[PDB]
Amino acid sequence: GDVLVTGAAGFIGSHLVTELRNSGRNVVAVDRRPLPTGSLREIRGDLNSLNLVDCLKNISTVFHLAALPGVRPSWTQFPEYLRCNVLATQRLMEACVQAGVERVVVASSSSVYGGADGVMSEDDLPRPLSPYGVTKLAAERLALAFAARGDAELSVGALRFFTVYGPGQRPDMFISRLIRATLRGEPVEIYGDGTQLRDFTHVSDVVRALMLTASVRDRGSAVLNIGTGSAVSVNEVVSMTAELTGLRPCTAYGSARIGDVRSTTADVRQAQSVLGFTARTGLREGLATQIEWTRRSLS
Amino acid sequence: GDVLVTGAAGFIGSHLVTELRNSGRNVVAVDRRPLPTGSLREIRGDLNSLNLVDCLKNISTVFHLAALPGVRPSWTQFPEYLRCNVLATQRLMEACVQAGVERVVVASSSSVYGGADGVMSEDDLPRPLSPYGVTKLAAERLALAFAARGDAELSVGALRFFTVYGPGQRPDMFISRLIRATLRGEPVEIYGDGTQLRDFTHVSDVVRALMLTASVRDRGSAVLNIGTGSAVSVNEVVSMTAELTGLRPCTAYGSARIGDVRSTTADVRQAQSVLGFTARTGLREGLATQIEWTRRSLS
Ligand SMILES: NC(=O)c1ccc[n+]([C@@H]2O[C@H](COP(=O)([O-])OP(=O)(O)OC[C@H]3O[C@@H](n4cnc5c(N)ncnc54)[C@H](O)[C@@H]3O)[C@@H](O)[C@H]2O)c1
Ligand SMILES: NC(=O)c1ccc[n+]([C@@H]2O[C@H](COP(=O)([O-])OP(=O)(O)OC[C@H]3O[C@@H](n4cnc5c(N)ncnc54)[C@H](O)[C@@H]3O)[C@@H](O)[C@H]2O)c1
Ligand SMILES: O=c1ccn([C@@H]2O[C@H](COP(=O)(O)OP(=O)(O)O[C@H]3O[C@H](CO)[C@@H](O)[C@H](O)[C@H]3O)[C@@H](O)[C@H]2O)c(=O)[nH]1
Ligand SMILES: O=c1ccn([C@@H]2O[C@H](COP(=O)(O)OP(=O)(O)O[C@H]3O[C@H](CO)[C@@H](O)[C@H](O)[C@H]3O)[C@@H](O)[C@H]2O)c(=O)[nH]1
């Protein structure tokens, strides 16, 4: 059957569209922004306005990536985060039940874990530290509640991504801003002392995990971390970018932002056992891919 | 300091207002519906429209009970459930940070557990089966995220209530409808075969738990079940009501409603250790209190 991707114009979504089409799948793309062997049908619209059942005609698999994804604006833009991240999810899942979609792969987030040292496992109680994390937890729990309805023949794979980077990374993210601070001298502010850590996951690995998750169809629903299990500090990413480029990143240290967790590290075990997924790209290699893409993109 | 109760016109809220005032506390009541030794100041308004910081002047303790509380309408009224249960909570917690409120006691729900046999413990992963349960989980996680902000001197006691009944019970609830089916012959539909079970908790016990929770001020935040640990089936409640009244309840069996969990039973241990709270009222005694109140109320 055909596949529908919400959020298809965005960072992860555009990579997923490419891989789906290269694999021979016909793709229906939904986004309110323009898109950058399988066919491609672009539907331009807001999930809260489109006739979603019409969009889901002959769709057997949905990848739900649309959302407002920034941690820090969520404190002061909460109506819009609720509308885009929770209400739109609820509408999409109802339409999936009505249209007889078989499987929905939902982008969730490591943000549901909140603050924790060391490994974040899918059996840990969620305790988001930001309103954004609350909305991603609500979206993933909504998806699971729809899959548990007695009238639905619907499974859900909810994927908790860990800070994704690479070619095309959204420009509000740290590595994208740092690379512009390096190649173009546009200063980046460091939010705190730079000792915060992230499990940075390359988008190519995330797209492989998304495809694997969609192919697990007879095992019910699942909640899985998608990450590398290796955390790197902000300061270390700055030093690596300086080393790779021979240009001094234009940085300025400022105050930590409330809502930012101090460290993330994925427990990678359950995705390996359920999907056969292990991340292949480490940060040193992946960072070079983003730097090279950004050069060519600016030229 | 003075205490503010949101949802003060409702079932649990009105009982809490009474006990707060009888205890000598000055109460500020907020609700968009009229209210049925401590003074009482009634503020009439919607939490999404009022100047909440103004309402919180000289308030040291907030009891957040306002919400749309029905499980079953939440599938088809989801915008309003998000607005009342999640957006209003976020606005209230921000105003609590800005106003320097010390402690917020939040009404959460056993609905966050979803479907589970046997005892529901606060260490179990939440898995709500209805959009209502998703909104209560979001409200309680929001409250905890605000309490964890570095700029807040704020603690949260989040109370997961188990199906509350007694004098004044909301008329959409089962025991209220059954009593009208008995005393007044207004038929009640049974949603399924009546073998579903609930941990029914008397409102007097819930109000005692609310007061105890507010008095724990130097131990940070807590998430606690408030229930009896004894589950009773719908059919057994029907037979008890018939026995107590000598009138045949006017019932009609119909189809189970999607979103209704099959059974609830509270793990009562953590509230006993943290609050010294143990429920005192069992269903046979409590059911008689509601029947007697309802007689006098109808006359
Ligand atoms: N990038 C990461 O590090 C990361 C980490 C964890 C989780 N996630 C999650 O992965 C998903 C994709 O993230 P991304 O970095 O690609 O974000 P992105 O902002 O690049 O892509 C999201 C897309 O969704 C669209 N969109 C938003 N609301 C919409 C609406 N109401 N209707 C139609 N389209 C709408 C946007 O136009 C955008 O193109 C998001 O759900 C996000 O929460 C991302
Ligand atoms: N009754 C139960 O069995 C039970 C069980 C678990 C949890 N809870 C929770 O306990 C709390 C109280 O439940 P209840 O049975 O007393 O419900 P209720 O409906 O009787 O009381 C809720 C009150 O909140 C008010 N309200 C709703 N939205 C408002 C808004 N935007 N602004 C101002 N006021 C608003 C309503 O007018 C109403 O009086 C709710 O948070 C509910 O989710 C109740
Ligand atoms: O200009 C900036 C931007 C970010 N940071 C810091 O860099 C780290 C990473 O920030 P960023 O790349 O913006 O990603 P996160 O805020 O960690 O969020 C990403 O990863 C989260 C967890 O996976 C997802 O929930 C989010 O949607 C996704 O944006 C954090 O410690 C920030 O405090 C700075 O110092 N300066
Ligand atoms: O007309 C009716 C109403 C209810 N029921 C059944 O009676 C049980 C109890 O229903 P009700 O008294 O409406 O309470 P719940 O739906 O269990 O919800 C209450 O208890 C939940 C868990 O504590 C809270 O989350 C909710 O806010 C609160 O309304 C359920 O099995 C219903 O299916 C019927 O058979 N007929």
Q: Secondary structure of B262-276 in the HEC alphabet? A: CECCECCHHHHHHHC
Q: Which residues contact B239 (CB under 8 A, 6 or more apart)?
A: none
Is the CB of residue A135 less than 8 Å away from at least one CB of chain B?
Answer: yes
- What is the secondary structure of A64-118 as a DSSP string? E--S---SGGGGT-HHHHHIIIIIHHHHHHHHHHHHT--EEEEEEEGGGG-S-SS
A1-165+199-227 — its CATH code?
A: 3.40.50.720
Query: Which A positions 150-179 lie with beta carbon below 8 A of chain B?
Result: 150-151
For residue B155, list its beta bridge partners: B103
CA–CA separation, A150 and B250 (whole Å): 28
Give the relative orientation of helices A174-183 and A234-245 as an angle to the nearest 10 degrees. Answer: 30
At the second CATH level, the architecture of A166-198+228-299 is Alpha-Beta Complex (3.90)
Tokens of B17: 């207002």
> Directed axis angle between helix A283-298 and helix A174-183, to 10°?
60
3-state DSSP of B117-149 = CCCECCCCCCCCCCHHHHHHHHHHHHHHHHHCC
Nearest residue in chain B measured CA to CA from A139: B134
Contact A145 B90 (CB under 8 A): no
Distance between CA A8 and CA A36 in Å, rounded? 9
Closest CA to A117 of A190, A193, A192, A199: A199
A30 within 8 A of A40, measured Cβ to Cβ? no
A106 bridge partner residues: A64, A158
Asked if the domains A1-165+199-227 and A166-198+228-299 are classified in one and the same CATH topology, the answer is no
Distance CA A105, CA A64 (A): 6
Q: Does residue B174's CB lie within 6 angstroms of at least one atom of ligand 4?
A: yes
Contact yes or no for A71/A133 (Cβ under 8 A) = yes
Q: Match 């409250």 to its residue by tokens.
A: B143
Q: Where are the alpha helices (DSSP H) in A152-282?
A: 174-183, 203-214, 234-245, 269-275
Under DSSP, the state recorded for A263 is B
Nearest to A154 by CA among A169, A142, A170, A165: A142
Domain spans of chain B, in order of start: 1-165+199-227, 166-198+228-299
State whether residue A26 sits within 8 Å of chain B by CB. Answer: no
**What atom in ligand 3 is closest to the CA of residue A165?**
12
The bridge status of strand B197-198 relative to strand B232-233 is antiparallel
Contact: A258, B150; criterion CB under 8 Å: yes
A131–chain B Cβ distance below 8 A for any pair: yes
Q: What are phi and psi of B273, to 5 degrees?
A: -75, -40
Least CB–CB distance from A129: residue in B126, B127, B145: B145
Cβ(A139)–Cβ(A67) below 8 Å: yes
Rounded to whole angstroms, the Cα distance separating A132 from B84 reads 18
**Per the annotation, does B265 bind a ligand?**
no
B109 lines ligand 4 (CB under 6 A): yes
For testing the chain A interface, which of B134, B135, B223 should be mutated: the one with the most A CBs within 10 Å?
Answer: B134
Q: Give B42's strand partners.
A: B29
Q: How far is residue B218 CA from its own chain's centroid? A: 24
B155: burial class by Cβ within 10 Å (0-12, 13-18, 19+)? buried
Give how far B123 is from chain A: nearest CA, Å: 7
Is the separation of the CB atoms in B112 and B259 below 8 Å?
no
Resolution (A): 1.7
Residues with CB under 6 A from ligand 3: A 69-71, 109-111, 161-163, 173-174, 177, 188-191, 196, 198, 234, 257, 260
10 Å CB burial of residue A70 (0-12, 13-18, 19+) is middle
CB contact under 8 A, B114 and A79: no
- Experimentally, the structure was elucidated by X-ray
Q: What are the C-alpha distances in Å from A21 to residues A38, A55, A293?
A: 4, 18, 21
Reading the block at residue A13, the tokens are: 């979504």
Give the pairing of strands B59-64 and B2-6.
parallel
Q: Which residue in the list A113, A132, A165, A253 is annotated as catalytic?
A: A132
Contacts of B93 in chain A (CB under 8 A): none
How near does any CA of chain A get to the CA of B92, in Å?
A: 12
C-alpha distance from A179 to closest chain B C-alpha (Å): 30
Name every chain A residue with its beta carbon within 8 A of the beta carbon of B127.
Answer: 141, 144-145
Contact B82 A78 (CB under 8 A): no
Rounded to 5 degrees, φ, ψ at B216 are -95, 100
Contact B137 A138 (CB under 8 A): yes
Q: How far is CA B225 from the centre of its chain?
A: 11
Chain A contact for B114, CB < 8 A?
yes
> Would you list the DSSP string of A122-172?
TTSPP--SSHHHHHHHHHHHHHHHHHT-TT---EEEEEEE--EESTT--TT
Bridge-based pairing of strands A164-165 and A155-161 is unpaired
Partners of residue B59 on adjacent β-strands: B2
In DSSP terms, which residues pair with B2 in a beta bridge? B59
**Least CA distance to B124: which residue of chain A?**
A125
- Report helix angle B131-147 to B88-99, nearest 10: 10
Q: Judge whether A138 is closer than 8 Å to chain B, CB to CB.
A: yes
Q: Which residue's CA is the nearest one to ligand 2's atom 26?
A: B66
How far is A80 from A73, CA to CA, in rounded Å? 10
